[PDB]
Design an enzyme around this catalytic site. Structure first.
Site, PDB file in Angstrom:
ATOM      1  N   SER A 278      -4.948   9.727 -11.814  1.00 51.47           N
ATOM      2  CA  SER A 278      -3.789   9.485 -11.511  1.00 51.47           C
ATOM      3  C   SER A 278      -3.933   9.035  -9.890  1.00 51.47           C
ATOM      4  O   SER A 278      -5.167   8.466  -9.512  1.00 51.47           O
ATOM      5  CB  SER A 278      -2.802  10.100 -11.423  1.00 51.47           C
ATOM      6  OG  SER A 278      -1.851  10.041 -11.144  1.00 51.47           O
ATOM      7  N   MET A 279      -3.444   9.052  -8.631  1.00 51.05           N
ATOM      8  CA  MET A 279      -3.393   8.971  -7.615  1.00 51.05           C
ATOM      9  C   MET A 279      -5.288   8.758  -7.350  1.00 51.05           C
ATOM     10  O   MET A 279      -5.590   8.556  -6.282  1.00 51.05           O
ATOM     11  CB  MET A 279      -2.512  10.009  -6.668  1.00 51.05           C
ATOM     12  CG  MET A 279      -2.502   9.182  -4.848  1.00 51.05           C
ATOM     13  SD  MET A 279      -2.808   7.316  -5.496  1.00 51.05           S
ATOM     14  CE  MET A 279      -1.389   7.319  -5.429  1.00 51.05           C
TER      15      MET A 279
ATOM     16  N   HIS B 184      -2.898   6.148 -15.319  1.00 52.42           N
ATOM     17  CA  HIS B 184      -1.585   6.264 -16.066  1.00 52.42           C
ATOM     18  C   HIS B 184      -0.218   6.065 -14.942  1.00 52.42           C
ATOM     19  O   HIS B 184      -1.133   5.633 -14.032  1.00 52.42           O
ATOM     20  CB  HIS B 184      -1.530   7.613 -16.872  1.00 52.42           C
ATOM     21  CG  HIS B 184      -1.576   8.797 -15.674  1.00 52.42           C
ATOM     22  ND1 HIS B 184      -1.008   9.910 -16.480  1.00 52.42           N
ATOM     23  CD2 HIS B 184      -0.897   8.425 -14.232  1.00 52.42           C
ATOM     24  CE1 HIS B 184      -0.778  10.721 -15.492  1.00 52.42           C
ATOM     25  NE2 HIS B 184      -0.411   9.929 -14.193  1.00 52.42           N
TER      26      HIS B 184
ATOM     27  N   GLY C  85      -1.579  13.354  -7.888  1.00 51.47           N
ATOM     28  CA  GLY C  85      -0.130  13.888  -7.076  1.00 51.47           C
ATOM     29  C   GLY C  85       0.792  13.013  -6.227  1.00 51.47           C
ATOM     30  O   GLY C  85       1.125  11.239  -7.262  1.00 51.47           O
TER      31      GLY C  85
ATOM     32  N   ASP D   5      -1.943   8.442 -21.035  1.00 51.03           N
ATOM     33  CA  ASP D   5      -3.316   8.809 -20.236  1.00 51.03           C
ATOM     34  C   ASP D   5      -4.607   8.073 -20.812  1.00 51.03           C
ATOM     35  O   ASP D   5      -4.866   7.757 -22.155  1.00 51.03           O
ATOM     36  CB  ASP D   5      -3.650  10.456 -20.249  1.00 51.03           C
ATOM     37  CG  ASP D   5      -2.298  11.199 -19.956  1.00 51.03           C
ATOM     38  OD1 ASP D   5      -1.440  10.351 -18.519  1.00 51.03           O
ATOM     39  OD2 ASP D   5      -2.556  12.249 -19.681  1.00 51.03           O
TER      40      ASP D   5
END
Ligand SMILES: *[B]([O])([O])[C]([C][C]([C])[C])[N]C(=O)[C]([C][C]([C])[C])[N]C(=O)C1=[C][C]=C(O[C])[C]=C1Cl
Ligand SMILES: *[B]([O])([O])[C]([C][C]([C])[C])[N]C(=O)[C]([C][C]([C])[C])[N]C(=O)C1=[C][C]=C(O[C])[C]=C1Cl
Ligand SMILES: *[B]([O])([O])[C]([C][C]([C])[C])[N]C(=O)[C]([C][C]([C])[C])[N]C(=O)C1=[C][C]=C(O[C])[C]=C1Cl
Ligand SMILES: *[B]([O])([O])[C]([C][C]([C])[C])[N]C(=O)[C]([C][C]([C])[C])[N]C(=O)C1=[C][C]=C(O[C])[C]=C1Cl
Ligand SMILES: *[B]([O])([O])[C]([C][C]([C])[C])[N]C(=O)[C]([C][C]([C])[C])[N]C(=O)C1=[C][C]=C(O[C])[C]=C1Cl
Ligand SMILES: *[B]([O])([O])[C]([C][C]([C])[C])[N]C(=O)[C]([C][C]([C])[C])[N]C(=O)C1=[C][C]=C(O[C])[C]=C1Cl
Ligand SMILES: *[B]([O])([O])[C]([C][C]([C])[C])[N]C(=O)[C]([C][C]([C])[C])[N]C(=O)C1=[C][C]=C(O[C])[C]=C1Cl
Ligand SMILES: *[B]([O])([O])[C]([C][C]([C])[C])[N]C(=O)[C]([C][C]([C])[C])[N]C(=O)C1=[C][C]=C(O[C])[C]=C1Cl
Ligand SMILES: *[B]([O])([O])[C]([C][C]([C])[C])[N]C(=O)[C]([C][C]([C])[C])[N]C(=O)C1=[C][C]=C(O[C])[C]=C1Cl
Lengths: 183, 182, 183, 184, 184, 179, 179, 179, 178
Positions: free
Chosen positions: H85-86, H110, H56, H159
């Site tokens: 990701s986050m 990523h 997010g 990714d």
């Protein structure tokens, strides 16, 4: 819409015989076409009658007045013939034909009523729009009075709500001159 | 909206006779504000009520439900503009008890004429126009009485959107004082 | 909607404890069911003490309005009616329905009266049935309003032909309310 | 919906006095609630009358019969009181109250008419749907005949199109027993 | 749109264009202006001295599209007669007043409406400022030209266009927007 | 939102207000109400306003700003995540010496945005209003930061992203909060 | 539509094809074709093929009145379906020259419409559609030999007729047997 | 959600925080508030942050990240399902030695994503901002994992899906939690 | 469609292409083409190619009755698919002159429709569609030689036939070999 080869679409072929068909709602595009046809026919022959068939639910007042004023301006008489229905600006244009040459077919309907519109914005703007539509109604009533022989006060009362007339009633009212009997 | 345990935060302020008008004014908001004013009058008929106003305006009839209730009840209603009091918001701001109408220093006040719509037959448009014009005259007369400005000046000053600072609103007579920090 | 702690009430439930009912929205079956239930509850709590019905309403369904109207007339307590903001259409009809002598409006409240509105679609026979129904409904409304105001049915008919906006003082003069509540 | 603290919503408070409020269209959710209220009240007291207020534009035939059959099954008499409007399945339920205890307020409206529906698909499927709705109409007409004293032939004719009755006309028809007049 | 055969086949508008008649019967946008400008340039090339007849039935439209037409009228050698039928509003009435002096007409029931420009602007304060300055400069340019075309002062035009201002054909003549009402 | 009170109501007991969304009239009404409540509970003890906000309505922001300056307690401001636009204006509004950002929090400053539609006169009125609003914002931010109005005007012409250390150098905060 | 387009080629032989819903555009076209054919030859028969689900009453009367007005006889030939205003125009053909193909369907029913607004407006619309129905019934009575009372009862709901039933009813004169 | 506590409030009593959604400002505000609440209850006892998140907002993630680093208690991080990701950035942010993943949990890393529309100058500002954000993220992840910034840059270009054991080898976690 | 357009060129050779769903517009065109060809030559055969998923029953009967009415024989040739009203028209060609190509499909089934409104209105619509099915079954019985009872059973649900099965059923006379 079919073609006739002497190549015309059917309406262009009728226009050759000085017949104009007003068979839809009246908006600026329709008025521009009708006016152009009237100007063309006057240029082709300034003395022979023109025949304006009317089957219309009505539409814009200013578009209607473009047609109305062109009819009154040109030299040829414009006969008006109501088939199906002449409502609202449609019936106003029917009454606008040359006196003695306004007709309706026996089962055609005529409807008269007052103008309709909308207004949005500040109180001042609503006031301006209201004054405009009321002055428009007065102008319409005055002309219809002249075209029918009815008083302005009677026209005003009779157009307060939708008022449907038979062809015979439209003749008695003065909106047309004759109910067209079959050949 | 957080909870306070001795209430949602607004109910807790209402216990201290504070009403928060922080949205557009529609019938639901007016019914709630009127009910709060009537409740506060029944709880204590003599103690002041504090009506905070941060509102872009809304329905005239909904505003008059609030306005007439303020004038009817016995307690004084102090009005406090925070953020913005526009249109019916500024009318209600000016409706507070005389001497007890305030704005915070950076709050904005806006006044203008009523707006509306009308559709239908010419007769119907005429009825609608006469109604909104009569409504404007009533609002202008009351605003004249609440501010001390002439009706003619109010009419001129509300022809278009007219944005005032808190100090300008005090000079105009819409509020009595700009609230200085404590 | 804020809460008040005496247990815990929403603001409207707290007013209901003092026999105050708030009719502050359009009138549909859900609203009528709530108002009727409150009236029946209050009569059961005390059949003698006045009820206070506040009205800020743009109107709504005639039949939902008559559920409220008939309940008011049926129960024993007097129902005072108090217009704040606006009482239009079925709203003003219910305002006029309060106990005689106990119908009020605040000074800047608006009252509007007019005729019923509706729609009908389908076969000619179905449109006829719908038309007869709405015309009979208008006759019933006019008869009751004549009884509540003292105006003749003929005057009510004329005065409700189009939207008719009244100030609180004009509504008092008309007989829709008994007093303007002046500060 | 306001609250009453003895905490009840207003409808729960009326239910304590054996009053059930039918104030909406009749669908399966409404029928389930009304049936549950009727069963609850019988369990609380099998002898005391129940009061069913009806302000309804109608709705599902099967949902209506869930209510209808429950009324007839339980021991307490169910009085029916029309306020505002009782239309279509609403007027059928009004007529279903205990005989002698069916009422309408003076300005309430009652409307009766035939069932409505839809059918789509193969000719055979349309035939089945048509036969079902026609049999449903026969069932409704027979029961309404029994509740009102009117013949099945008269109900069939009188429900061909929407038929709006005043409260007094509904009494004359046999849909209710009395118009509740105000003391005033 | 009907056809006329003279074989050369014309739509009705092309046939009028042969007689130096241009029909402006819609809102004024870039497509309409391009067509009108092209017709004016065509007619000037066909005969640089004979009058052109521009009929106007228009609710108005884009200011820049209107000025493409206005500047072409003033640039070409033939006189352009303007004839209002139905309504000339907003950029429509501006073009009506742009016709050759002495040759601006309205039919007796035609309406003329004048008012100030309208627009929209969204974005940063700096962007809103640029858009506001632009529309205000546009209004000043329109008022200056209308003052020259009508003989009215710029101050009077500014006041008279603050809100929508509807004129009869006779009022438009008194104002100086047209020269004559065309009598039947 | 978990229960302990919901988590925010429990922090409010310790005089902590969480401003963690866009700023509209509803959010401003809530924050103002919390500030007034905390002052009424204790007029001397500090309040802690956490700010993670992309910004929002100018007038809703000024309702909060004016309440902060009006009440007696000092309001500490703490930027976590991002304080943008009206969010960064409120960050700069905390008690001088008690304005903080966490080391990886971001601050963004820019000029107001809006719309205007209608007649030329109406567009002129809206333009004048938003331009006067920008002048008011710049004047206060100048007072809160020590930067000149001219510098603030230039620096807010477009989106201007600052690190926590850059926000301290700018005068928007007093200290970067070290763990 | 293959190529004259096929319909224009049939029009050369005085054949008009009414093969759609009846609206003002269709009526304008049919009326124009009828007027054109009369002007070409005022004595020769015209052939009007009808395959139509119906449509607007006033558009239908534009065609009906034109048929009765012009000098040539208009034969009507139902193929597929003539419903509603379609069956009314079928009955409008010259007496003795109204036909249906053996498997063509004819349907008659009462007019349909809408009304919205004040009670007075609904009353005006109801009176209008009821007077329209009386006019339709009177003409259909004249065209078929059935009484107005019978037509009223038989059009209360959709009433589907075979070609032979339509002949018995008087809507057509003959069922067209293969040549 | 079963129940007086809801199930999550009951876990919070045992110092367990469940991050089980996308990370936006609302989620960050709640996680931050829970962390502050737990520190106030006991500044010495460990906190357990479960992470099942697709990622997010970067700024919302840094509100959580900076709060973890600020408070006194150690925050253990436990990846269940997925940390992308986050989400994976916050997994790596737990107390060193106390970062875990369940054996079948997935980790994905990523580069940041975003959008920009408008004038060339505005696009330039947005591009510079997201590039500086990427540099900041890579710098911190280098510190948390022990990998070089150059390697992280290459490994996040597209990714990059890791198993729990691969995430341990990478340095994103300390141990795979075996049953 | 290249361009006479390709269809107009085939029409000159008395070939009509029915290559779509059957609605009133398609029926009006096909009928006009049949009448035109009869007027051009009342004795020469007409060729009607059918690739159609079916469509409106009344539109189909406009075509069907015109085929039976005119003097020339109308040969029918199924290519691709003749379903529903499509297969009804295939069976309507001149006996001995109904063909299908070897891989063309034929499907027969009962009519479909909808009805909404009062019980009385649903009854009228149900009676209409049932009478329509009876009419279709009677004609198909005459065209195929199958009993009405067999047609009824065989059309209760969608019934897909190969070209050879359609020949055995009597819907066509011959499978066209290359
Ligand atoms: B009729 O419905 O054609 C009627 C004209 C009769 C009364 C002669 N047409 C209108 O009244 C039109 C209706 C629109 C929906 C096209 N109204 C106007 O043209 C008009 C005139 C004046 C104003 O001033 C506000 C508004 C409108 Cl909308
Ligand atoms: B303000 O924008 O709150 C303004 C009130 C000021 C002038 C005191 N509100 C209105 O003027 C509202 C705006 C609506 C969009 C809610 N207008 C009315 O309440 C109103 C009053 C009278 C009429 O008569 C037609 C219409 C309307 Cl819409
Ligand atoms: B008012 O808008 O509340 C008005 C009632 C006044 C005249 C006392 N309400 C109605 O007239 C309603 C309006 C609807 C949009 C809810 N109309 C009816 O309740 C009604 C009555 C009768 C019929 O018969 C067809 C239709 C309708 Cl819709
Ligand atoms: B009334 O509108 O409540 C009416 C019942 C009266 C006649 C006693 N309700 C219905 O007829 C409902 C209408 C739906 C829109 C809810 N119809 C049915 O319940 C029903 C019954 C049977 C069939 O068979 C096909 C269909 C339907 Cl929809
Ligand atoms: B009229 O409505 O034609 C009017 C022109 C008169 C005053 C001469 N037209 C406009 O004002 C148009 C209206 C748009 C809806 C097409 N406005 C513009 O052309 C225009 C001009 C300048 C600016 O600057 C922001 C905006 C606009 Cl939209
Ligand atoms: B920031 O995006 O929060 C910014 C405020 C900063 C510069 C201190 N907010 C605004 O500029 C808002 C943006 C809206 C989309 C909510 N703008 C206003 O509040 C505002 C102010 C003045 C005017 O006058 C026309 C309009 C607007 Cl919309
Ligand atoms: B048929 O469906 O063609 C039928 C006409 C038969 C009875 C001769 N057509 C109509 O009844 C049409 C249907 C519309 C949906 C096009 N109705 C009208 O033309 C009509 C006539 C009168 C009124 O007065 C309210 C309304 C309508 Cl819509
Ligand atoms: B991951 O999808 O959580 C990723 C963060 C990783 C690389 C640590 N998230 C983002 O990159 C988000 C995706 C949005 C859809 C929420 N991007 C931002 O937060 C962001 C950062 C900077 C800019 O500058 C223009 C834009 C965006 Cl959208
Ligand atoms: B086939 O799908 O072409 C089939 C015809 C076969 C059985 C010979 N077509 C229909 O059955 C059509 C389907 C429509 C979707 C176009 N149905 C009708 O034509 C029809 C006939 C009768 C009724 O009465 C209610 C309805 C319908 Cl829709």
């Amino acid at each position: 819409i079919p073609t006739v080869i002497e190549a015309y679409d059917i309406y262009s072929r009728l226009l050759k015989d000085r017949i104009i068909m007003l068979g839809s709602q009246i908006d600026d595009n329709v008025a521009n076409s009708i006016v152009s046809q009237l100007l063309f026919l006057q240029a082709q022959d300034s003395e022979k009658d023109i025949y304006l068939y009317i089957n219309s639910p009505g539409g814009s007042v200013t578009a209607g007045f473009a047609i109305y004023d062109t009819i009154q301006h040109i030299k040829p008489d414009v006969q008006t013939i109501c088939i199906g229905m002449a409502a609202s600006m449609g019936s106003f244009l029917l009454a606008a034909g040359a006196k003695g040459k306004r007709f309706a077919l026996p089962n055609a309907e005529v409807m008269i009523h007052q103008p309709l519109g909308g207004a949005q914005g500040q109180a001042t703007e609503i006031e301006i729009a209201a004054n405009h539509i009321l002055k428009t109604r007065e102008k319409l009533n005055r002309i219809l009075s002249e075209r029918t022989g009815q008083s302005i006060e009677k026209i005003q009362k009779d157009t307060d709500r939708d008022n449907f007339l038979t062809a015979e009633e439209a003749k008695e009212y003065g909106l047309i001159d004759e109910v067209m009997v079959p050949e």
